[PDB]
Amino acid sequence: MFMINILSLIIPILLAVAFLTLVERKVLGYMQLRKGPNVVGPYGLLQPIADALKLFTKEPLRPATSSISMFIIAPILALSLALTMWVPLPMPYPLINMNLGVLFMLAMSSLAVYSILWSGWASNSKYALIGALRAVAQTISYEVTLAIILLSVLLMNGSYTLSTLITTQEHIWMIFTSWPLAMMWFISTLAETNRAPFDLTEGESELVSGFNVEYAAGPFAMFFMAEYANIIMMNAFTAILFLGASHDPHTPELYTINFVLKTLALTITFLWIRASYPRFRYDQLMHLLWKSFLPLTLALCMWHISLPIMTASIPPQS
Amino acid sequence: MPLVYMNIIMAFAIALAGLLMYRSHLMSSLLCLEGMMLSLFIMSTLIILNTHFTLANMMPIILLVFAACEAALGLSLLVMVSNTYGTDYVQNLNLLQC
Amino acid sequence: MWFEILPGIAVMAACLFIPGMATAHIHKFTNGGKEKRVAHFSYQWNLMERDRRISGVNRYHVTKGLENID
Amino acid sequence: SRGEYVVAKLDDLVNWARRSSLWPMTFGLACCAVEMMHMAAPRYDMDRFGVVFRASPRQSDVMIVAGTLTNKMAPALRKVYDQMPEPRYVVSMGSCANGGGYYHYSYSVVRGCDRIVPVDIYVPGCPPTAEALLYGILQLQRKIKREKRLRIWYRR
Amino acid sequence: LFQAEKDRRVLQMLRENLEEEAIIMKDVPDWKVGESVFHTTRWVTPMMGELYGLRTNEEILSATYGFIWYT
Amino acid sequence: PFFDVQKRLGLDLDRWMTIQSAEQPHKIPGRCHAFEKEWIECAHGIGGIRAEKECKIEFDDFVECLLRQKTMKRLSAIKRQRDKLIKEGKYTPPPHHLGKEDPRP
Amino acid sequence: MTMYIAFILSTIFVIGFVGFSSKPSPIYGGLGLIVSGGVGCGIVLNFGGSFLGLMVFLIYLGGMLVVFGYTTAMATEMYPEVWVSNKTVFGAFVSGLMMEFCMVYYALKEEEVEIIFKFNGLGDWVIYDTGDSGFFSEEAMGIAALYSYGTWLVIVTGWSLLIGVVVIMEITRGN
Amino acid sequence: MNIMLTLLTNVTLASLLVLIAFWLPQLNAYSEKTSPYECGFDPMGSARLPFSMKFFLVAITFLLFDLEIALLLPLPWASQTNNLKTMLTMALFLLILLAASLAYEWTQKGLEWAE
Amino acid sequence: AGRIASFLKNAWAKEPVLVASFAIGGLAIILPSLSPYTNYAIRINRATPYNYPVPLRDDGNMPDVPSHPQDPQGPSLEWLKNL
Ligand SMILES: CCCCCCCCCCCCCCCCC[C@@H](O)O[C@H](CO[C@H](O)CCCCCCCCCCCCCCC)COP(=O)(O)OCC[N+](C)(C)C
Ligand SMILES: CCCCCCCCCCCCCCCCC[C@@H](O)O[C@H](CO[C@H](O)CCCCCCCCCCCCCCC)COP(=O)(O)OCC[N+](C)(C)C
Ligand SMILES: CCCCCCCC/C=C\CCCCCCCC(=O)O[C@H](COC(=O)CCCCCCC/C=C/CCCCCCCC)COP(=O)(O)OCCN
Ligand SMILES: CCCCCCCC/C=C\CCCCCCCC(=O)O[C@H](COC(=O)CCCCCCC/C=C/CCCCCCCC)COP(=O)(O)OCCN
Numbered sequence A: 001m002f003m004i005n006i007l008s009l010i011i012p013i014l015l016a017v018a019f020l021t022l023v024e025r026k027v028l029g030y031m032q033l034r035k036g037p038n039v040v041g042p043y044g045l046l047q048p049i050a051d052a053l054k055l056f057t058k059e060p061l062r063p064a065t066s067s068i069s070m071f072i073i074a075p076i077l078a079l080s081l082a083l084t085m086w087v088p089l090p091m092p093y094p095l096i097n098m099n100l101g102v103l104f105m106l107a108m109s110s111l112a113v114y115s116i117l118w119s120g121w122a123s124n125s126k127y128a129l130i131g132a133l134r135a136v137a138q139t140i141s142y143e144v145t146l147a148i149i150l151l152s153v154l155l156m157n158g159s160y161t162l163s164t165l166i167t168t169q170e171h172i173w174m175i176f177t178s179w180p181l182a183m184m185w186f187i188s189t190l191a192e193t194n195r196a197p198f199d200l201t202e203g204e205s206e207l208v209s210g211f212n213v214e215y216a217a218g219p220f221a222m223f224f225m226a227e228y229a230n231i232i233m234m235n236a237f238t239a240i241l242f243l244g245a246s247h248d249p250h251t252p253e254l255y256t257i258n259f260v261l262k263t264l265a266l267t268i269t270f271l272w273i274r275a276s277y278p279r280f281r282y283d284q285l286m287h288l289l290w291k292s293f294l295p296l297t298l299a300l301c302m303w304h305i306s307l308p309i310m311t312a313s314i315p316p317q318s
Numbered sequence B: 001m002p003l004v005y006m007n008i009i010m011a012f013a014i015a016l017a018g019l020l021m022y023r024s025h026l027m028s029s030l031l032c033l034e035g036m037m038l039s040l041f042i043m044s045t046l047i048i049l050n051t052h053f054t055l056a057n058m059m060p061i062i063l064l065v066f067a068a069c070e071a072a073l074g075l076s077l078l079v080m081v082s083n084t085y086g087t088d089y090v091q092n093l094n095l096l097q098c
Numbered sequence C: 001m002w003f004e005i006l007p008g009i010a011v012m013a014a015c016l017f018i019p020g021m022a023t024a025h026i027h028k029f030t031n032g033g034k035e036k037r038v039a040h041f042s043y044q045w046n047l048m049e050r051d052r053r054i055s056g057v058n059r060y061h062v063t064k065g066l067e068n069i070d
Numbered sequence D: 001s002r003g004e005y006v007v008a009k010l011d012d013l014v015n016w017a018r019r020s021s022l023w024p025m026t027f028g029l030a031c032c033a034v035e036m037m038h039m040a041a042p043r044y045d046m047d048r049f050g051v052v053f054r055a056s057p058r059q060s061d062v063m064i065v066a067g068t069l070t071n072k073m074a075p076a077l078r079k080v081y082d083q084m085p086e087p088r089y090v091v092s093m094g095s096c097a098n099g100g101g102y103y104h105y106s107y108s109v110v111r112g113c114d115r116i117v118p119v120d121i122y123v124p125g126c127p128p129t130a131e132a133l134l135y136g137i138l139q140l141q142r143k144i145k146r147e148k149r150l151r152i153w154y155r156r
Numbered sequence E: 001l002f003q004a005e006k007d008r009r010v011l012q013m014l015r016e017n018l019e020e021e022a023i024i025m026k027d028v029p030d031w032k033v034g035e036s037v038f039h040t041t042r043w044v045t046p047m048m049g050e051l052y053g054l055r056t057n058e059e060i061l062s063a064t065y066g067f068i069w070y071t
Numbered sequence F: 001p002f003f004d005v006q007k008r009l010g011l012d013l014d015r016w017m018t019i020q021s022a023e024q025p026h027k028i029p030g031r032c033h034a035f036e037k038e039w040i041e042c043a044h045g046i047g048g049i050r051a052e053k054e055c056k057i058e059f060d061d062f063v064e065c066l067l068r069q070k071t072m073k074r075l076s077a078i079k080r081q082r083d084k085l086i087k088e089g090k091y092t093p094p095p096h097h098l099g100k101e102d103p104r105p
Numbered sequence G: 001m002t003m004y005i006a007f008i009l010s011t012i013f014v015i016g017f018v019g020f021s022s023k024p025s026p027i028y029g030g031l032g033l034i035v036s037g038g039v040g041c042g043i044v045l046n047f048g049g050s051f052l053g054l055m056v057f058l059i060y061l062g063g064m065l066v067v068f069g070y071t072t073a074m075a076t077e078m079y080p081e082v083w084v085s086n087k088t089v090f091g092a093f094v095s096g097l098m099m100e101f102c103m104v105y106y107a108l109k110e111e112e113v114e115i116i117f118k119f120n121g122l123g124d125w126v127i128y129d130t131g132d133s134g135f136f137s138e139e140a141m142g143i144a145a146l147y148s149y150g151t152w153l154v155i156v157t158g159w160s161l162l163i164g165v166v167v168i169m170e171i172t173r174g175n
Numbered sequence H: 001m002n003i004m005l006t007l008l009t010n011v012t013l014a015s016l017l018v019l020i021a022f023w024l025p026q027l028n029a030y031s032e033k034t035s036p037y038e039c040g041f042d043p044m045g046s047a048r049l050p051f052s053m054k055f056f057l058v059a060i061t062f063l064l065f066d067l068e069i070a071l072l073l074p075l076p077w078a079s080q081t082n083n084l085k086t087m088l089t090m091a092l093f094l095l096i097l098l099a100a101s102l103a104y105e106w107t108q109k110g111l112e113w114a115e
Numbered sequence I: 001a002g003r004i005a006s007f008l009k010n011a012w013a014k015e016p017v018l019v020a021s022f023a024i025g026g027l028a029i030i031l032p033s034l035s036p037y038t039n040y041a042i043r044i045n046r047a048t049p050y051n052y053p054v055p056l057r058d059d060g061n062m063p064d065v066p067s068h069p070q071d072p073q074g075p076s077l078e079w080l081k082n083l
């Protein structure tokens, strides 16, 4: 019966990714004084279906100068990790209940970078190499600040379990307690998902197509799905972490609906941000994270260590 | 001793033998050193968990810390070597004899 | 329209509803309709094992009340 | 036969997917590219037809030759054409790409892009209006709707 | 209550293990039934290899990996 | 060499972690707490040379608690004799070792 | 030996070690070390050390990424070596695999001592403790206890880390 | 067991997707189609040449700082202890040393990239 | 008063992030020692019953030890119920 649950977690996420491509296109169109896809199907509903069919019936290309084994492995790893992201998330009941869910998600997110790294290296192309090195720089920029941000925000929770976050925010949202962190966390997610203004590993204005310039058809499609699935998963994680919905043990549908609405709002927020700002330089992102976010993150970590002790409000779980 | 203990010990032995043999690259030997730290971490963690030594649960963490500095140290040396020769080949480290 | 983006967002919401709702329904169905037990620590797992042993059918969710005291 | 019906339906489905989503490589040479920029502008909004510019040739379906092809540029055009995964289509935009145009009798001009690559649609004009290029794009879509690959494979 | 039940369950399983160990060990020349491995005569907590050793594999998994694998 | 500043100053910099019988958090005991306690109390002040010989019984018990080699050998003997009796068909293991035991709380 | 899970993971660990032990290239050495780190995380998790396994995986994942960055810049070679592109790399890889296989076969079919002592087998489930108590994790409290108990360890570790930063700055100065 | 099944299913789905991608469409690969792409012209060197990295010092600093986060990870459990003053003092001391390391490298121009 | 004020004003003009970080860090260092609720936090941590309270064997002269959990003797958590 667990296989049915795995499939029910996998297939709807892929469909939601396919249709997020559509929403992303239509939102950008209407924010740029145009319409967007509205011809293929009613209101463009069949465009995602059309895009998938064309991509998987087109010939995949294997570069003459590229390592083939790692070239094939990289998109598989990216997509598999993107799908594996979702199993510990409580909606309100996680598929896998872990005592350490935040750590698991953090470690797997760290592992996800090697797909981009090995795609850039295995393609044996100069632009792919530049994109891979930009990915290295981005990860070095963001992981430390993101980790201390998680630690500081979870001090209030008292445990790394994702499920306990619903109990922590039963009366108020976490964003009313740690809004200065949430902002930074938000920006960190934009860097972790390689999204504007931090779309540097796949920068089309400089690197033609970045790390996946040599990829085509199915492997490119899998990379694209991994990107959008990671976007949705990170927005869901932000919603659970900072916007705690109420849960009825006899009626979890209300929690599911509210959580989905918040996740959609955050995803639309990313789509809105992409159409509003220019792109950074990959050294400017590192300087922003190290010279601005790191000192504030350390100070707020000290503050959130001290505050429960000062106010006698330490969370329960040992 | 279970088979797991012998597997971890022989992994450490393999990493040590890999370090003690140099092909051309210093980076490969640094990787072998880091592998030795990983094997030691796994072995000590298994020993501590098996015997329920509670207060020793913190020593693997400390171990990892003193891996990183060491690893960091090695990386620093490597770049200097590169800056002198343009390659990380151990052949170029031959100005000093016995 | 600007409200023509709504069908795609609605399809997204319909797709994202399925994971959590199906997980909750499967948890109720497999564990007798009462919110599958969470065992974060060994004490809770021991409680589950005791329930499974005393259930007489090898299912932990089958609960025995006061009707087992004679 | 039922096999004939099945291959007809599959070909229709395959043809529809390709025509619905057409990605033209971000590639312009001269005057005509500006008009191409106006086809992506809010007034015409080629994106609403499923048409999206993509910088990488490996992720491109159409190559729109928008401008004068010179003798110095022809190898690069041929190279970027050869790196498009099949099926790929070429649309010749404007007089310069069609037949040399206003520089036909020049030492440094290729007299039509069709000496270098095979062309599907010839859009006339100097430059063709954004409506003219859009009409050519829809004509290419109709041509793709008309092709039959599974039927030929079944009969052969 | 749980402590009392645990004591009785462990003692019962040890007793069954001893009775079978007597059953298997009919004619081994110098084998003592129920011999300890410790010089000390105090109670030593069972190894859990001493308990489910002569039992089926499914409950061996349940006893060893049951808690770790349950999510 | 060994400059015992901890004993001189009464500081306890690192003596809290040397043994598993020394004040674990939440009073969690070691798996061989009793054996190490007995071995340490046997050899407290007699010295290393005398300890290695006179407190060998407690040390042997402690080590076999740590590694369980003798228990493994005994269980392996039991298992192999049971297997050879089963292969020729003279044992017929009881139902409660086959998963049919009437469970108890 | 039930489900052979710990033994299989340990075999993959040693196999993973062999791949980067061979020094075919920094890119594939890092890949092998990532594989061995992941399977070691699995091995530690199977024994109840969830936090320690996840921590070592994260640290290695972060560390390996830096190594990849360094490799492109300084350890790069025009024709990078894989385990079958060179005679000596393949020889070392095959030698490691065969030593793994022979030691496993001798220790499983027979009971032979390699260096320290011998083994019997029967799986790693025998050595367990059947401990039944607690609303907490023993590993979490042990790791958790460092702040309260290891005051000296925290001091020496923090001093070592700050000194290490200073050391890196001073070494990479050049001039 | 459930997590291993989940990972196996995810990897199997990705592998089936790549197999479908590589075995469904018609393939016509020749020499020039599979050549490296560098804007239309032939590349001069190879992508496997050394690639100078201007943030190596920041990379080593990230290696050292990554370890520090591991130390701070167990803080939530640490908060409970009965010796709250000692735990707070040590946590603040560790964070202060991390901040001092960052400040020292900042003031010594270690955060600026090579030219 | 006149020099540090100008320096702080210039730092706030140029580096507001650093000023905020140092202010928050200094507050987090100083205030815990000047708080009356830290002792309450330590008491709450001590009051959590993680493990079984093993009863003591009666010798006959332990007036401060209760014979029943509901006896008036022993520690009281009424300070916690109103906190
Ligand atoms: C989305 C996740 C779930 C998917 C679930 C399904 C899994 C899909 C598996 C992925 C592959 C499907 C792709 C669809 C077409 C299959 C391609 C291949 O298998 O067919 C040919 C396989 O034929 C080979 O020539 C092998 C023939 C004989 C050699 C060994 C086969 C021995 C089997 C015995 C057969 C006897 C009768 C069997 C029935 C009783 C290879 O042709 P080839 O030209 O290379 O490649 C181009 C294919 N084109 C033409 C369609 C473009
Ligand atoms: C002789 C000259 C001395 C000064 C020279 C300094 C150089 C040596 C480095 C520091 C030496 C000081 C020794 C401190 C060791 C810590 C242990 C002792 O102090 O007691 C602890 C008290 O720790 C307190 O937190 C105070 C010590 C913390 C010191 C703060 C920072 C000191 C660092 C200064 C030097 C380090 C290098 C330079 C840094 C810039 C434990 O208290 P408690 O919790 O009851 O007991 C726990 C055990 N239980 C659970 C069984 C009950
Ligand atoms: C009473 C006790 C209280 C304890 C202390 C608490 C008070 C703290 C008061 C200050 C908190 C402010 C911190 C907020 C985050 C820091 C922001 C910051 O300082 O960084 C900016 C930089 O910020 C950015 O540039 C962001 C760029 C990316 C923009 C992306 C989109 C914009 C945001 C969209 C909405 C975000 C929504 C956030 C919440 C989402 C829900 C979780 C400064 O950078 P520079 O000006 O370049 O200075 C360096 C040169 N000297
Ligand atoms: C021991 C206390 C610990 C607690 C607080 C610490 C928490 C974390 C904060 C520290 C993180 C690291 C800080 C690193 C500082 C380095 C500063 C530096 O060198 O940068 C200078 C610039 O920085 C300065 O301007 C000097 C310091 C500025 C003020 C710093 C704080 C001073 C005191 C403020 C707080 C006072 C107390 C709080 C009162 C607040 C009012 C209520 C150079 O700028 P560049 O980026 O290199 O290039 C610019 C030209 N292109």
Ligand code: SF4
Pocket (backbone or CB within 6 Å): D030, D031, D032, D033, D066, D067, D068, D093, D094, D095, D096, D097, D101, D102, D125, D126, D127, D128
């Ligand atoms: S056809 Fe006319 S408008 Fe177009 S590129 Fe040539 S000269 Fe310019």
